[PDB]
């Protein structure tokens, strides 16, 4: 029938209809107004090729299809392979002779046809058994005597190994690819396999098949059947207890309801999709959020917003760059990542030296080139480079650094993207006394400054936003820091706060103040 689903197949509806249109149309079409001999199937393992073969054989009212299970034709005696191969078409030839063009259609199944067909046999075969066998099959199917009452179907899990000579017209005309089903196909397969469950109301209403179809990603039909079988097995074994002897209650056995918990357990524990996963780690560059301990953060964010607006709405400045300067341990990467995130551009990426350990100069250059080339495809994009001084590894002795990477950066900083596209670049560095010497500070259009904590009021405000000390502790801290200078970075402040909460409550404030005094300094 043409139901496309009564045969228990899903996901190939369109290709099933195409097979109907292209394969059996001539047979369906009336003879008054008026063929296909070669059909090939291929796809990754576990897609339903054998089901298609069986249903195709059943559908048409013809003789029972003949099958060959792999290389059952090879033999140790010379000439037996050809005899076995020719034994197949006797009925076809006889029917042709007897009934002219009225001969009944014949079906031949070549399962695992890759065993026979390959790019010639190896030299050490003692003869051309492989080549002679394939030539005999080719001649029989494509002989001077041309039949019209035979159809041959081939199936393989690796099309690349089939000899091209068999794929030319007159031998293998139709080619079919069976791919991974879709979400609707997953729903249909689940419905087909759970119809038996729903027939007897043995499935708990707590299950939402839509949630399962959403969760199962890159699952073939076989894997979904395995998942269902695992869930059934878990539900069945919940009622069995075999450690001393096999035993079953036989009274509390009727319920035997598979619950959503069983499906979840089967998915999490004893099934794997057999496909890789994409990794996203850009959320790890902001581990503590942003707190407005002062005014400067607002100014920095406002300047970033203005720059984004200019790059978006400009006409003859497709490329814009900015530098983020500041003393060490001042939190420059976090602000740059935040400004990049607020842009909401289609394409964003972060280039950091954390992923390049042990790389030479050429590898670094190639990686940066690849990232920029990828960024050159979206309509408008932003890219950020952090810790420049560690990108062109720099050491105060000598000094020593990499020239190739510096030149690559200087070239890439002033190359416009293709016509009608926009790129933004944000660079971060802590020591600006060197970049001015290399002449790399003139390429950037503008620079922004990031300051440290410079007054006790700001330190106390940050402490409050963190919420660690209270009452007399904060009062004493204020009394002792209302007439003194404070020069601390926020990261160092967090480190100190973590440090000073390890001893007893009596000594906490004294230890914290001692550490602050020790680390305190002036510019």
């Amino acid at each position: 029938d043409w139901n496309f689903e009564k045969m228990g197949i899903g996901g190939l509806d369109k290709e099933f209809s195409d097979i109907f249109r292209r394969a059996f149309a001539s047979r369906v079409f009336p003879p008054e107004i008026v063929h296909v001999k070669g059909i090939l199937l291929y796809g990754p393992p576990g897609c339903g090729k054998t089901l298609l073969a069986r249903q195709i054989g059943k559908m048409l009212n013809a003789r029972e299809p003949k099958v060959v299970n792999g290389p059952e034709i090879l033999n140790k005696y010379v000439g037996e392979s050809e005899a076995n191969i020719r034994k197949l078409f006797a009925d076809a030839e006889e029917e042709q002779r007897r009934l002219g063009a009225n001969s009944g259609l014949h079906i031949i199944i070549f399962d695992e046809i890759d065993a026979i067909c390959k790019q010639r046999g190896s030299m050490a075969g003692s003869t051309g058994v492989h080549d002679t066998v394939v030539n005999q099959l080719l001649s029989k199917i494509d002989g001077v005597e041309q039949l019209n009452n035979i159809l041959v179907i081939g199936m393989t899990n690796r099309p690349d190994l089939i000899d091209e000579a068999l794929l030319r017209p007159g031998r293998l005309e139709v080619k079919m690819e069976i791919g991974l089903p879709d979400e609707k196909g997953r729903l249909q397969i689940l419905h087909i396999h759970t119809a038996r469950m729903r027939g007897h109301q043995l499935l708990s209403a707590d299950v939402d098949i839509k949630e399962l179809a959403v969760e199962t990603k890159n699952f073939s039909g076989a894997e979904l059947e395995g998942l269902v079988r695992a869930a059934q097995s878990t539900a069945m074994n919940r009622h069995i207890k075999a450690s001393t002897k096999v035993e079953v209650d036989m009274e509390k056995a009727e319920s035997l309801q598979v619950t959503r918990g069983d499906f979840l357990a089967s998915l999490e524990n004893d099934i794997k999709p057999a496909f890789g996963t994409n990794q996203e780690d850009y959320a790890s560059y902001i581990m503590n959020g942003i707190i407005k301990w002062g005014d400067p953060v607002t100014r920095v964010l406002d300047d970033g917003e203005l720059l984004v607006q200019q790059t978006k709405n400009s006409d003859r400045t497709p490329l814009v760059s900015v530098l983020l300067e500041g003393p060490p341990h001042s939190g420059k990467t976090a602000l740059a990542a935040k400004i990049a995130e607020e842009s909401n551009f289609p394409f964003i990426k972060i280039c950091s030296p954390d992923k390049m350990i042990g790389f030479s100069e050429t590898a670094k250059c190639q990686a940066m080139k690849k990232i920029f080339d990828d960024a050159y495809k979206s309509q408008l994009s932003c890219v950020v480079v952090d810790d420049i001084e560690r990108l062109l590894d720099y050491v105060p002795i000598g000094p020593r650094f990499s020239n190739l990477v510096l030149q690559a950066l200087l070239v890439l900083l002033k190359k416009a993207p293709p016509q009608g596209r926009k790129l933004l670049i944000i660079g971060t560095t802590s020591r600006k006394d060197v970049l001015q010497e290399m002449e790399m500070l003139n390429a950037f259009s503008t620079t922004i400054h990031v300051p440290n904590i410079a007054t006790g009021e700001q330190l106390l405000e940050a402490l409050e936003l963190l919420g660690n000390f209270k009452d007399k502790e904060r009062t004493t801290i204020a009394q002792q820091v209302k007439g003194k200078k404070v020069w601390i970075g926020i990261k160092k402040l967090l480190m100190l706060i973590e440090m000073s909460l390890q001893m007893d409550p009596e000594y906490r404030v004294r230890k914290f103040l001692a550490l602050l005094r020790e680390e305190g300094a002036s510019p």
């Binding site: 140790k76 005696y77 010379v78 000439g79 037996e80 030299m123 050490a124 075969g125 003692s126 003869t127 058994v129």
Partner: protein, 37 residues
């Protein structure tokens, strides 16, 4: 220029032609033995 390799071999029993049929000449000898008797 990598080189210097090896290989393995197999065989095939090609003398499939039967020989038992032509070796059953005993009955003719039996008939001629009866004649000599």
């Amino acid at each position: 220029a990598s080189g210097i390799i090896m290989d393995s071999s197999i065989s095939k029993q090609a003398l499939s032609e039967i020989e038992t049929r032509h070796s059953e000449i005993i009955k003719l000898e039996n008939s001629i033995r009866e004649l000599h008797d």
